[PDB]
Structures are given as C-alpha cells and as structure tokens.
Design a protein around this ligand. Structure first.
Ligand SMILES: CCc1sc2ncnc(N[C@H](Cc3ccccc3)C(=O)O)c2c1-c1cccc2[nH]ccc12
Length: 151
C-alpha cells in the first residue's frame, strides 16, 4: 500500500489499456504526481500507438499464437511476459513494447467481449514491470525519466 511507484505505474498502464480498448478517455483525476502521470499517458498514446501500428503483424502473430479466449488465457500471458520481458535487457524501448502489446491484447479483449479481463491484464503488466525492474526504474527517475526520455 505504501508504494508510490507501483500505484502510479498501475494508474498509467490501467488507463492506457482501458482507453486503447474502448476509445474513451478516463476523466477521473490522477491522485499524487498528476502532472507526471498525465504526461506519461500522453507519451504512451504517441509511442505506444506507434509501436502497435509499426509492429502490427508481429503483435497479431503473437496474439494468434497465444489464442486468448478468457481469463485463464490472460492469467497465463503473465508467465509469458516474465520469461519474455524479465529475461531480456532493461530499457524504455522494451518497457513501451510490453505496455503496447498489453494495449494490443486489451483491444482484442474488447473485440471478444472479455472487457472484465482488461483490469487484471493491466495489474499483471504493472506487477511484471515494477516487481522485476524496480531498481532500474528508480535509477531512471521512474515516469519522470520515461517522459523526459521520449520528450
Ligand atoms: C509476449 C510478447 C512480448 S511482451 C514484450 N515485451 C518487451 N519486448 C518484447 N519484444 C521486443 C522485440 C519486439 C519489439 C517490437 C515488436 C515485437 C517485438 C524484445 O524482446 O526486445 C515483447 C514481446 C514480444 C517478444 C518477441 C516477439 C514478439 N512478437 C510480438 C510481441 C513480441
């Protein structure tokens, strides 16, 4: 509960996936360090949308292989993301890739009428990110470092 990095990471990732899936912006205010969270979500819309467009075939290929139909499938994706994401090197390129693939899957979840799985997917991505890359994120100045890196 006393973990600002986790709270802010979940807020950003949750909002991006939800707005990617529904096409609607969330109007609830951002709690603590609102400006940073706003700018981060703003950066994701530019860079994340970019990754999904530029790498559509690779994302569609991966989604087809994973065959997501339900909550059990979304649960097993987290195991995949740990192996895939956590075993490789650490940088904002791969972090945006992970979150962008998150958003790609979220749109699929809306397509197949499994919207209830989007919040659990966002929490699973947040947990992989902040659990496996804590020390890297803190050293990089967290979401302020993310905003500055993609300016
Ligand atoms: C679970 C899917 C995931 S999460 C994930 N998180 C971070 N990085 C990833 N990939 C980048 C390479 C990359 C870059 C852009 C588009 C595609 C790949 C990296 O490892 O450096 C992946 C992948 C992923 C891995 C391998 C093939 C893939 N094809 C579709 C997604 C995907």
């Amino acid at each position: 509960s006393e973990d600002e990095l986790y709270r802010q990471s979940l807020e950003i990732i949750s909002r991006y996936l939800r707005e990617q899936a529904t096409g609607a912006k969330d109007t609830k205010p951002m709690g603590r360090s609102g400006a940073t969270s706003r700018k981060a979500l703003e950066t994701l819309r530019r860079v994340g949308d970019g990754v999904q467009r530029n790498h559509e075939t690779a994302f569609q290929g991966m989604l087809r292989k994973l065959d997501i139909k339900n909550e059990d499938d979304v649960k097993s994706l987290s195991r995949v993301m740990i192996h895939v994401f956590s075993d490789g090197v650490t940088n904002w390129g791969r972090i945006v890739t992970l979150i962008s693939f998150g958003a790609f899957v979220a749109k699929h979840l809306k397509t197949i009428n499994q919207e209830s799985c989007i919040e659990p997917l966002a929490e699973s991505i947040t947990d992989v990110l902040v659990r496996t890359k804590r020390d890297w994120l803190v050293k990089q100045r967290g979401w302020d470092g993310f905003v500055e890196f993609f300016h």
